């Protein structure tokens, strides 16, 4: 996350971190329930085998609240392709259930029509992750969050050198130096409504990080709600 703030105790409980063999975090994810994690499909190519850590806010040490979970089943969207980054979504089922607690809780899945007319028409959303704090920098050891304004769909298409499909949306600033970045992928983009946070996006991609005239691109969760339900049901 470039700019923004540090997630304080209990502020970003639905955040999940995918870690590789060396216990290094390479992508984020969102806690949907005790057994399910939402993430980006392009994160499944960033590492051979990986585990999911919840409750962490600082990777430099072990507070005692963190918790690691093995991945039982991996459900990647079949239509995903690195060529367009379209359908950049995946759901992970854990072997053991997450123990909800301080810093560990799920984000709510909204209904499609309500989400699109009431959540995505809000001024801002919130993105978080352990990603880079600068375009060329390293992974952050502290979990960060950032209020990102929803971006007019038209303005976004005109600013992008790549196609913005109906399965993605944009958020962030035109020139202000705040944006998600590499390492935040798969992470949550949630929208607040009356003190309740609903999953609305998945950190997907962007041309650089916080670059002027460029926005952050996210997978439009409302476009995959049925797909998500199926993944969690079956």
């Amino acid at each position: 996350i470039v700019g923004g703030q540090e997630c304080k105790d209990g502020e970003c409980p639905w955040q999940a971190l995918l870690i590789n063999e060396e216990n290094e975090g390479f992508c984020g994810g969102t806690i949907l329930s005790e057994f399910y994690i939402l993430t980006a499909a392009h994160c499944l190519y960033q590492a051979k085998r990986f585990k999911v850590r919840v409750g962490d806010r600082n990777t430099e040490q072990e507070e005692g609240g963190e918790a690691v979970h093995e991945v039982e089943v991996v459900i990647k969207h079949n239509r995903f392709t690195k060529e367009t980054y379209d359908f950049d979504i995946a759901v992970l089922r854990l072997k053991t259930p997450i123990t909800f607690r301080m810093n560990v809780a799920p984000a709510c899945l909204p209904e499609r029509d309500w989400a699109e007319s009431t959540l995505m028409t809000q001024k801002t959303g919130i993105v978080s992750g352990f990603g880079r704090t600068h375009e060329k920098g390293r992974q952050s050891t502290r979990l960060k969050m950032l209020e990102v304004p929803y971006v007019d769909r038209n303005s976004c298409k005109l600013s992008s050198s790549f196609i913005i499909t109906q399965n993605m949306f944009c958020a962030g600033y035109d020139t202000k130096q705040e944006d998600a970045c590499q390492g935040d992928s798969g992470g949550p983009h949630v929208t607040r409504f009356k003190d309740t946070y609903f999953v609305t996006g998945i950190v997907s991609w962007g041309e650089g990080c916080a670059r002027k005239g460029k926005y952050g691109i996210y997978t439009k969760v409302t476009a995959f709600l049925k797909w998500i339900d199926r993944s969690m049901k079956t």
Binding site: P13, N103, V104, A105, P106, C108
Partner: peptide, 9 residues
């Protein structure tokens, strides 16, 4: 721990 609520404790 209902979904969507930040945790105070």
């Amino acid at each position: 721990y209902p979904c969507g609520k930040q945790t105070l404790e």
